[model samples]
Target: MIQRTPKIQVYSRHPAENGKSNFLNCYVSGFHPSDIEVDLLKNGERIEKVEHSDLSFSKDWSFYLLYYTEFTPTEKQEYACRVNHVTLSQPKIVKWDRDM
Candidate 1:
């Protein structure tokens, strides 16, 4: 049997409080099959699904961006990335009016 592992690289940016949006970019790798699911979780809730494409060697990567409207009114929000049944990265806490 072939063992499959998953890898992900994430980049996050939060704009100044002057009404700009935050951006999140994730590069996922080592996904098998075409049905791998990618999800974005915020405060233990599923917010959105990341769009993913195939990479070299049966790998894949995805990208996501969160706008200011999505998190401005909140105090502290937790964000994370998940693939299949595994949580591949750590939960990032984003504070309001702070740069990520």
Candidate 2:
């Protein structure tokens, strides 16, 4: 099987007008083929709640696809984005922290 890994990115936006609540955006992109599974996580546990968007082409207009999930951010927590695909022997992960 061909091996491919997703490029994961996490971004947090400014807090909402009502106190401190930021939006989190995690993207899994630039991977071969269009079949891939992605998940949001808090610590090591998978978070089933999220708004996943439809796949779109990367900015470069390559054949690969980009998948993303959006949610609210929490303080003092590390969020992880996990990816699963036929090319991977195990789940691939990328992490996000409030500090960065």
Candidate 3:
């Protein structure tokens, strides 16, 4: 097995539904096993709804997966993505704002 750590990436933005809805995609990649948990948050509150795809393997050396969730959040609110895995001592988190 490879000795590696998971990498985290977070993104939030609007495309067409700039009024009623928005989406946040939390991408955790380059890890082993791919048995991981992810969630979205707003102001320390856990988002009840989250959608994610199956884990995918890299070309040769590792694995990757994407956790995605869309919410009809309020304007100017801060959004965060949290990742949990066996290799981590604590959950890894990434935050995003409107400017991002």
Candidate 4:
């Protein structure tokens, strides 16, 4: 087996309300078949659930970010992408600051 480091690239964007805009995209790499559970948590509580079984891997054995939503904002959001309890990637934080 080829020992490799997994990486996930994430990007966010705001589209125009009246015109076509580019969608946010993420490229994840270096994942094993067993690593197929992705969870999105907010404030230490589970919020979004993603199943790896619904995703497709690349030729390099990396998974790609299919789709995500920004409908709700949380003060301390965490992303858990794992397989068999082994975390393939570290939890990512989602932070927002608005002076309202």
For model 1, give the RMSD to the true fold.
6.9
For each candidate in the order shown, give its overall lDDT on alpha carbons.
Answer: 0.44, 0.65, 0.74, 0.41
Q: Any runs in candidate 3 off by more than 4 Å, and if so which?
A: 13-21, 59-61
Q: Give lDDT for model 2.
A: 0.65
How big is the RMSD of model 4?
A: 6.0
Best by TM-score: 3
TM-score of candidate 1 versus the correct structure, residues matched by position? 0.48
Candidate 1 regions with alpha-carbon error over 4 angstroms: 1-3, 14-19, 49-75, 85-100
Model 4 C-alpha lDDT per residue in residues 1-100, reported as the tens digit of each score? 4444445444444556823443232334566543444444444555443332235666664554443434333345433322222453445433222221
- Decide which is better by TM-score, 3 or 4: 3
Model 2 misplaced regions, further than 4 Å: 1-4, 15-20, 58-75
Q: Give the range of the ten consecutive residues with the poorest summed lDDT in model 3.
A: 13-22
Cα-based lDDT at residue 61, candidate 4: 49
lDDT tens digits by residue: candidate 1, 6-73: 55554465657744765554445554443345555566576654443333542244322222113332
How much is 36 displaced in model 2, in angstroms? 0.7
Rank the candidate models, highest lDDT first: 3, 2, 1, 4
Per-model clash counts, in order, read 2, 0, 0, 1
TM-score for each candidate, following the candidate numbering = 0.48, 0.67, 0.75, 0.45
